[PDB]
Amino acid sequence: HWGYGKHNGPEHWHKDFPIAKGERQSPVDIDTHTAKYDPSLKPLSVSYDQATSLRILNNGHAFNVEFDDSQDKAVLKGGPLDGTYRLIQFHFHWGSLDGQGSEHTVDKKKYAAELHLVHWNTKYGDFGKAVQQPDGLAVLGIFLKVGSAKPGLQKVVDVLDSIKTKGKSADFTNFDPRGLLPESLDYWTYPGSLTTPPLLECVTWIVLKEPISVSSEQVLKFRKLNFNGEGEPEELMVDNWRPAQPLKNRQIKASFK
Ligand SMILES: O=C1Nc2c(Cl)cccc2S(=O)(=O)N1
Ligand SMILES: O=C1Nc2c(Cl)cccc2S(=O)(=O)N1
Ligand SMILES: [Zn+2]
16 A cells, blocks of 8 residues: 555555656645746635534544535635635644655755645535546645744644554544634645645645744654554654655746735
8 A cells, every 4th residue: 555665655656546647746846936926816715713623533644634524614715716615624744854844845945844724626516526626626735844833733733642543533623723824825826636645636736935833842743643553563654745746837826926
């Protein structure tokens, strides 16, 4: 099964998922000098006030905080998007060391981690239908650097002990994802894909320019999670990131000068 090890990692994924070598794969390096300001891009609208978190799951690849997406409660609109996209889950990718972990890079710089807030286009009715469409998902990507703690992350950090191993879940209600956002919503955007199998080319990527700061202790706790199930040999959940993929025939657009 695919993963992040030497014998099942990103360089192997194309054998089961040939779209891994496709025309709009993610992540990519964001070359800040080549991204063009697009004055027709609108401000992002992030409307998370009525978000209903439900559960946190270790799925063997990351941990996902899942939301009730059966109504328009937490939605992303505006920016490059047409229509309304509903928040379904968020998760992170992170490194074994503070010098790596993000999937997107900025002028080849790797951040310590990257947050993905995953939303699906309500015109397709459900997430499974949306991933079959070129405009089915919008993923809001936020970089994490190590410095001061992020207060709004701590409730996530403190439940990770209860979902150490693959397949474990825990109740995770009343979590407010607004506490994970930076001050500015300036962003880069481009068309891409899921960054794990099935690698479907269904994502409008919206990557915020401003990172959030998390503490060394917060990210150290991410690194105590396990890829393995309970009662299996312990393999720390670290370096669960895909490296940058060829940009090919795409342009990255900036919302800001
Ligand atoms: O600014 C840069 N940051 C890097 C990081 Cl964070 C990791 C690897 C390579 C680079 S880089 O040297 O290409 N230039
Ligand atoms: O690793 C990732 N896997 C995803 C899956 Cl499986 C579903 C949707 C969005 C993502 S993601 O591209 O945001 N990052
Ligand atoms: Zn992701």
